[PDB]
């Protein structure tokens, strides 16, 4: 995978982890 696309996908994966925590903790 092209690196800049990969970095954008890593942004999404990290924000998804944050969404998981927010839901766990609400």
Residue numbers in the entry: 1 to 26
What are the paper's exact sentences on this?
Several natural systems exhibit ‘facilitated dissociation’, in which an effector (E) can bind to a target–host (TH) complex to form an excited ternary complex (THE)20–26 from which the target dissociates quickly. We set out to design protein systems that undergo facilitated dissociation. We use a switchable target binder (host) and a flexible effector that can rapidly bind to and switch the target–host complex to induce a large steric clash with the target, forming a strained excited ternary complex. We show here that by explicitly considering excited intermediate states when designing coupled protein systems, a broad range of facilitated dissociation systems can be designed.
